[PDB]
């Protein structure tokens, strides 16, 4: 019974990072080696596990988180990082057990006139906790004056558009990111290699 990684990695549409998608993977066989040895990925960085051992391991669950960010923001999808994406959109824990997988998606996610569909959160009163998702759109008070829910001077809608242009340099181009979290509870482990 094959893990549905196709549905994750080959989804036509990816989530905005602020509204990052999570798929729970369970009760299935996963060939991680075929992903790890793929030339398709520009980032494949594992924490707390060796990628060469993944086909020999069983986990209680795998969570597949996915979203789009800029090439120059992929460095923020790692334990201990800071910046608008790590702080306000998607935060990995210090004790992360999993792999961060990314690839350039300029051919899918940019278009003539710009693709404005992908958003990020630019403003928040505090940093996200690890694996916290915030999809709120409260007006952010950026000045000394209360906003009273009105977008205006120093009163910001907290989400902004990347506006991906196909002519953007590689740092500004869209990257698709899949984060695999490996859960190791003292319980039956139902997601295994071949």
């Amino acid at each position: 019974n094959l893990c549905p990684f196709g549905e994750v990695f080959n989804a036509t549409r990816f989530a905005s990072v602020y509204a990052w998608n999570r798929k729970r993977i369970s009760n299935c066989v996963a060939d991680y080696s075929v992903l790890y040895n793929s030339a398709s990925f520009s980032t494949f960085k594992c924490y707390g596990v060796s990628p060469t051992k993944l086909n020999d391991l069983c986990f209680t669950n795998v969570y597949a988180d996915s979203f789009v960010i800029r090439g120059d923001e992929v460095r923020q999808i790692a334990p201990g990082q800071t910046g608008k994406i790590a702080d306000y959109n998607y935060k990995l824990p210090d004790d992360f057990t999993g792999c961060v997988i990314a690839w350039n998606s300029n051919n899918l996610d940019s278009k003539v006139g710009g693709n404005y569909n992908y958003l990020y959160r630019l403003f928040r009163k505090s940093n996200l906790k690890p694996f916290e998702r915030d999809i709120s759109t409260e007006i952010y008070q950026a000045g000394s004056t209360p906003c009273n829910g009105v977008e205006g001077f120093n009163c910001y809608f907290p989400l902004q558009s990347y506006g991906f242009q196909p002519t953007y340099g590689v740092g500004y181009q869209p990257y698709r990111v899949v984060v695999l979290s490996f859960e190791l509870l003292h319980a039956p482990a139902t997601v295994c290699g071949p």
Epitope: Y116, E151, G152, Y156, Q160, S161
Partner: nanobody
Amino acid sequence: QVQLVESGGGSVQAGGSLTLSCVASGVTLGRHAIGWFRQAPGKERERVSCIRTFDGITSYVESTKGRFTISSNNAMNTVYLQMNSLKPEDTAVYFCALGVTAACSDNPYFWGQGTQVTVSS
């Protein structure tokens, strides 16, 4: 504070083209409406073109449709006005203008100092 840095413009003969640029600082493009106004001799300041940087939707006035093209590079915080098929009556001070909402139909809040465009007959 927010600043709008304008560049481009100057002199061109009728039928020629100019490109104006506007760089926003103190604000990040991707939510607000940003665009151009102009003030020709003996005329009130008027809308030229606007782009919603949240969703890329552009707007023009009857005298600018087709000839002028507005575009945004959100990553570079820059908007551009490509002005083709210029006429002497396009002679004006061109102002970059930034709203505090997403809507191009709303009044601008922040103004550039303005850039002279002179089209010779």
